């Protein structure tokens, strides 16, 4: 699945090293993981929960926190922020 991230998502991807405009969904998830971990956004004692109200990720996703157990919810938040091209 090939996607074109919208400006805020693109900015977050590039902030962890990405240098292009079109990505696979695998790449988008990879870079978002790198972003979450470098920014230390997951709770050290409840590690499936991401806290993002003090981060651009929270602006992107429109939530102050989320769980990585919630796959459908996360896909929705990501898809809102890109255009799928195939």
């Amino acid at each position: 699945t090939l996607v074109r991230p919208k400006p805020l998502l693109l900015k977050l991807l590039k902030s962890v090293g990405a240098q292009k405009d079109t990505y696979t969904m695998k790449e988008v998830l990879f870079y978002l993981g790198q972003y979450i971990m470098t920014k230390r956004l997951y709770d050290e004692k409840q590690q499936h929960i991401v806290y993002c109200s003090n981060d651009l990720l929270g602006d992107l996703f429109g939530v102050p926190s989320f769980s990585v157990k919630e796959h459908r919810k996360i896909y929705t938040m990501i898809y809102r922020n890109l255009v799928v091209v195939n």
Partner: peptide, 14 residues
């Protein structure tokens, strides 16, 4: 993107 026990396990080797 399949082990959801923790953010590092969800991303490791993915």
């Amino acid at each position: 993107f399949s082990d959801s026990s923790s953010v590092p396990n969800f991303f490791r080797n993915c």
